[PDB]
Paper text:
The Phox homology (PX) domain was first identified in the NADPH phagocyte oxidase complex subunits p40phox and p47phox, and has since been found in proteins in every eukaryotic species from yeast to human. Despite relatively low overall sequence homology, PX domains all possess the same core fold, consisting of three antiparallel β-strands (β1-β3), followed by three α-helices (α1–α3). An extended sequence traverses the protein between helices α1 and α2, termed the PPK loop as it generally contains a conserved ΨPxxPxK motif (Ψ = large aliphatic amino acids V, I, L, and M). Side chains of residues from the β3 strand, α1 helix and PPK loop together form a binding pocket for the headgroup of the canonical lipid PtdIns3P.
We have also obtained two crystal structures of SGK3 and SNX23 (for which previous structures exist), as well as a crystal structure of SNX15, the crystal structure of SNX32 (in complex with a peptide from the bacterial IncE peptide) and the NMR structure of SNX25. Last, we observe an unusual domain-swapped structure and membrane-binding activity of the SNX15 PX domain. Interestingly, our binding data are similar to that shown previously for the isolated SNX15 PX domain; in contrast, however, the full-length SNX15 protein bound relatively strongly to PtdIns3P24. Further work will be needed to clarify the functional oligomeric state and membrane binding of this protein.
Residue numbers in the entry:
A (entry chain A), B (entry chain A): 8 to 35, 40 to 77, 89 to 123
The structure:
């Protein structure tokens, strides 16, 4: 099953216009099997939306007794988004995260 | 580890005054190892309080992207309280529940 790590880096400009981000999903001992894809911020928005709806899902019972440096911030944002899904079973085993890769 | 079931029954009046309830914790195949104790409604109130504080404990992060028949009702109430703790790891593995028996 390994352990999951994530790194979003290396922003490249596509000939069509939009910038692309390199997404690295590391499966780690100290030897790692890596899975690399390329995504744009729109896909990150979609994933964020799906996860955010998946997230904040709790409580169903009671108790009772009786200078285009914005791509850097986008990079770090997507990175935080991916890293936030590590220690939550609902997000880590989410089908949207698996279809994402 | 077995599977947990609970039955609160057989209300008896203690010579000192207070009524006592028979609490059966069943550890179940179809053959069950039983653990029986006797409790009063005060202990049930204490347990209920500890569990209720233990319960309703969620959310610590963000997301981001940019005719004294009242003893019957008391019996059923305590029974519901015990049965409610089965399918929750935080309540099932609670030390208050283990000290209770």
């Amino acid at each position: 099953d390994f352990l999951r790590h994530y790194t979003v880096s290396d922003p490249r400009t596509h000939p069509k216009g939009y910038t692309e981000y390199k997404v690295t999903a590391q499966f780690i001992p100290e030897d790692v099997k890596e899975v690399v894809v390329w995504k744009r911020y729109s896909d990150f928005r979609k994933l964020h939306g799906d996860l955010a709806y998946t997230h904040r899902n709790l409580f169903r019972r009671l108790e009772e007794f009786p200078e285009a440096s914005v791509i850097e911030e986008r990079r770090k944002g997507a990175e935080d988004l991916l890293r936030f899904t590590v220690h939550i079973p609902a997000l880590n085993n989410s089908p949207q995260l698996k279809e994402f890769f």
